[PDB]
Ligand binder design. Sequence first.
Ligand SMILES: OC[C@H]1O[C@H](O[C@H]2[C@H](O)[C@@H](O)[C@@H](O)O[C@@H]2CO)[C@H](O)[C@@H](O)[C@@H]1O
Ligand SMILES: CC(=O)N[C@@H]1[C@@H](O)[C@H](O)[C@@H](CO)O[C@H]1O
Lengths: 171, 171, 171, 171
Amino acid sequence: EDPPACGSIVPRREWRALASECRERLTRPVRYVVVSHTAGSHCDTPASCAQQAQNVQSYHVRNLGWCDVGYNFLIGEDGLVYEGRGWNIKGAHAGPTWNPISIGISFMGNYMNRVPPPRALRAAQNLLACGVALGALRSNYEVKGHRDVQPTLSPGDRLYEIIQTWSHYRA
Amino acid sequence: EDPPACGSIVPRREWRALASECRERLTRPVRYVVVSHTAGSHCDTPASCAQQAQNVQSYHVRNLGWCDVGYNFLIGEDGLVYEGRGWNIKGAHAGPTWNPISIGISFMGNYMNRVPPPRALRAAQNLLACGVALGALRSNYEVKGHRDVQPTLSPGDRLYEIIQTWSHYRA
Amino acid sequence: EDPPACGSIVPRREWRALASECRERLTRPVRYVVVSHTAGSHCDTPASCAQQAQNVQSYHVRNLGWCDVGYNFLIGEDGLVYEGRGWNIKGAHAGPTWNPISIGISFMGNYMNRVPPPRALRAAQNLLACGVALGALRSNYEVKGHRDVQPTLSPGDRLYEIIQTWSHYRA
Amino acid sequence: EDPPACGSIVPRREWRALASECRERLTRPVRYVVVSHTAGSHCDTPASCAQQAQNVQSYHVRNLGWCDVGYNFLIGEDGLVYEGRGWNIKGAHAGPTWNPISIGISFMGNYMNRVPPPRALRAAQNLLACGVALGALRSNYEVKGHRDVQPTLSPGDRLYEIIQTWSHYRA
Ligand SMILES: OC[C@H]1O[C@H](O[C@H]2[C@H](O)[C@@H](O)[C@@H](O)O[C@@H]2CO)[C@H](O)[C@@H](O)[C@@H]1O
Ligand SMILES: CC(=O)N[C@@H]1[C@@H](O)[C@H](O)[C@@H](CO)O[C@H]1O
């Protein structure tokens, strides 16, 4: 009944992110979403999770010399979504084939034998619904596991098993 | 002109590799070597490492839909090197920035909570010495860990810790 | 496999193609697409382009002694795609390394100092999309310029610069 | 802004269309396709059919006072499809019952005593297949002749009998 009806996200400033230097854009509406895990520690409070995002970005920018954290969005077990390169800027999370044509969302943690809490699964599912609402994603977008498109255990066996049941999943 | 028999490497046919569709070439002498782990099951026999190489290649070719196993060589816990894309063909193991300028060797197993056995480490060292002797690698080649150039746990904490001690490692 | 109509192709009979003697099949799905230019006259009407397709085939078959026009498909500045050897027959357009592993599409014209009009570019890219849906081409096919696989001006400097921007382009 | 939209459709700007003022959106997936003829001049080259498209729209907009050319798409005997109101905007081509629930495509010419060439018929099928692939048309869309839904000779006797033979046609 009025337009902007979709998910809250922790803004970069809020998680105290280094300025992005990335400028290559995606073309909306984007067709694919690749779900990964950071494979590191998880966080379960808004406090722990903002720090984690700064840590993930630090690894990609400081160590890897990347223009910004590689993921478009990050999911906290705080139940919050952390803004990464966002809906419009090409990410660096799934290789040269998938990066220019997808949105990379990464769950912050390691989900090989642990599942993300429901507030995390809700957070991610709402963000995607929001992306469709916004025209950032196609209504018939496809979700892929990181391991479906790159050689990796990402997004973790437990999380991978869950995304496979999602409405938009397509291997 | 030195063409000696330094390659105690298991030929693709011997491990029953599917034919490669890859054709892009590396330019020798190659300056970099990127060390990864398959993060999967290890093998400590020629029979089982031949099968493991097929399984890793199967993942890359049948699932990821790639032209070949992404690694230039694989290292088995049987102490044997398995021919992947080899010295002359660009691998798909460390991203587009590092793939054209490196040889990617991957240890078949997960080394976050394990070190490769001494025979696998000798296998890898002997292979790089072979690469220098053939002129495939620069005599002062630089070794990187997979996690130094891409976001990943690869090649595993224990293996990462070992390679950082190598004469050829360059931070 | 899947029966869906896709694209619009000028069938061989319609451009009055001599019958094909070619028998060697390509193995589905094909990974590569090589784009060339005929370096011949261009044409901008269905009538003139049907004639051009017949002329190119005449050259290849009568003068070069080949079993058919060398390209799998030809693209006219009329914005139409002309059926060449088609999706299933190995062509003669990129040398012995690349012929057996690719589909060759050629823009009828010389694009060193001219570009094909948008309608020719659309037809080409739509044809490739159709190839994917038919299972003729890999979903992750890679498009190369003829000059990427043989020393040649083809597909002409102007055309090459354009295909470099295509989604599936990989030098 | 990535690969071009399916169907090899000549964009409005390419045929120098007057800007549209139409706003009413269709509800996808649209169930019906209504085939009409313009009953105007035909054309058989990109140059002349772009001009014909412009002529048809000029009449609809300048003379009839409509927000845009009434058809969703136009088909030329050059074998190309001309973008009219497109996939998402409600047309003005089949009356108040049919406009809201269909995509109207119109063959540019008078098909009372003449058939459209094969390339023009292929273009139409290319277009409809494309609409299904986009989600603009339902997979099992139904094709109607203009005279099936309004008192008219459109789409012309000769074209009407062809349409009745299409697998998606429904009397
Ligand atoms: O090539 C553009 C972009 O490439 C790199 O980001 C890569 C990354 O190195 C790889 O890991 C790979 O998986 O794909 C990413 C993008 O496709 C560079 O790091 C970056 O500096 C450069 O702009
Ligand atoms: C040099 C380079 O980046 N190569 C890529 C790899 O990252 C990519 O994801 C995959 C899919 O084609 O295989 C290689 O071609």
